[PDB]
Design a binder for this molecule. Structure first.
Ligand SMILES: CC(=O)N[C@@H](Cc1ccccc1)[C@H](O)CN[C@H]1CC(C)(C)Cc2nn(CC(C)(C)C)cc21
Length: 377
């Protein structure tokens, strides 16, 4: 399909897809964000924008006469709502009319050299700003075209520059191997899921499973790290420390605020454990596990200045807002957002993570006869 390899990015800075807005079409790169539900594009000059949406140049622009403000984990923006024609040159061969927030002010949102100038929130209307009557893009796309109500993401961030695919309307079987395991979307707002068990080096963290979903867990392509509620993050760090205790790192490293560096080519991958996240299955008390390697959770930081070394930031961090399965954990899986059947599917992706000793995996089933719902509330 002409859709394969339509994502690009820089590591830690999100993955983006080419879109056009307006008529005649204005080309913009747009961040793919399953962690939010607003379509917003820079629409005035900013030191970090290479280009921006010029509403005056679009004869199909319609102004909704309504402001909007979106704060995310750290960045935020404000702008003006309207609608316009939108296309995805390397996606489905359609043009739809969609709501678009024209960002006119922002703080800590745009990133210097990221190459994107806007954001596609792919989650549900329940969390759109200003409220749930602002129809999200994907809903408009499905309503206006015959595109099936499903999209999949293969995020590779493999060899700063990263790639992948966003396949809309379909499952591309050349993008994964083995089977697809499905977890139910628990509620349609974020892509909310349920983690039932966490292991490090195969050792269970032995917590009540509701702690892992305090107070929701989501799948979030717009967030880099695996973020964990404090109690789970502390338990996990203790475990990973213990597994890797042949070397000691500063506390700043574990807090995500300092790099760790090894002379180029010598990163000791084998001293770090794998992490397994077990997700609720489609049948009662069954689960499957996705297993992640330290090549995924030690994120490389490209910097020519430090390049006699390879240097890494620890990409597991504390959350006061629930577990966030960010790009770290999506990378090397093919993740299918099957909105039509209210589930998300995971399979090992054609760009999987891989070492001569260990491989990321998606595998099941696992059973737990213990009858506790792991949903927080
Ligand atoms: C790290 C981050 O904030 N990512 C957001 C996307 C983004 C991409 C580039 C620059 C800045 C922001 C992504 O949407 C975050 N997803 C969730 C992460 C949460 C649940 C911990 C907090 C939150 N707030 N929002 C905003 C809203 C409440 C309006 C849905 C989205 C989210």
């Amino acid at each position: 399909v002409e859709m394969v390899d339509n994502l690009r990015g820089k590591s830690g800075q999100g993955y983006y897809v080419e879109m056009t807005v307006g008529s005649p079409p204005q080309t913009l790169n747009i961040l793919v964000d399953t962690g939010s539900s607003n379509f917003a594009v820079g629409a005035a000059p900013h030191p970090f924008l290479h280009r921006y949406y010029q509403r005056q140049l679009s004869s199909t622009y319609r102004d909704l006469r309504k402001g909007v403000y979106v704060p995310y984990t750290q960045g935020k923006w404000e702008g003006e709502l309207g609608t316009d024609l939108v296309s995805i040159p390397h996606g489905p061969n359609v043009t739809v009319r969609a709501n678009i927030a024209a960002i006119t002010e922002s703080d800590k949102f745009f990133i210097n050299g990221s190459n994107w100038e806007g954001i596609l929130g792919l989650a549900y209307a329940e969390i759109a700003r200003p409220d749930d009557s602002l129809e999200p893009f994907f809903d408009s796309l499905v309503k206006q075209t015959h595109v099936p109500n499903l999209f999949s993401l293969q995020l590779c961030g493999a060899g700063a520059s990263v790639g992948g695919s966003m396949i809309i309307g379909g499952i591309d079987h050349s993008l994964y191997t083995g089977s697809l395991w499905y977890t139910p979307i628990r509620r349609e707002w974020y892509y909310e899921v349920i983690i039932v068990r966490v292991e490090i080096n195969g050792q269970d963290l032995k917590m009540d499973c509701k702690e892992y979903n305090y107070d929701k867990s989501i799948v979030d392509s717009g967030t880099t790290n695996l973020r964990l509620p404090k109690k789970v993050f502390e338990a996990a760090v203790k475990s990973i420390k213990a597994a890797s205790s042949t070397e000691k790192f500063p506390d700043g490293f574990w807090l995500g605020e300092q790099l760790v560096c090894w002379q180029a080519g010598t990163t000791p991958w084998n001293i770090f454990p794998v992490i397994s996240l077990y997700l609720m299955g489609e049948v009662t008390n069954q689960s499957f596990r996705i297993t992640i390697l330290p090549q995924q959770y030690l994120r490389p930081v490209e910097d020519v200045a430090t390049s006699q070394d390879d240097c890494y930031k620890f990409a597991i961090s504390q959350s006061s807002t629930g577990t966030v399965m960010g790009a770290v954990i999506m990378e090397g899986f093919y993740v299918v957002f099957d909105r039509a059947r209210k589930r998300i599917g995971f399979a090992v992706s054609a760009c999987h993570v891989h070492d001569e000793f260990r491989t990321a995996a998606v595998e099941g089933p696992f059973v737990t006869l213990d009858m506790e719902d792991c949903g927080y509330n």
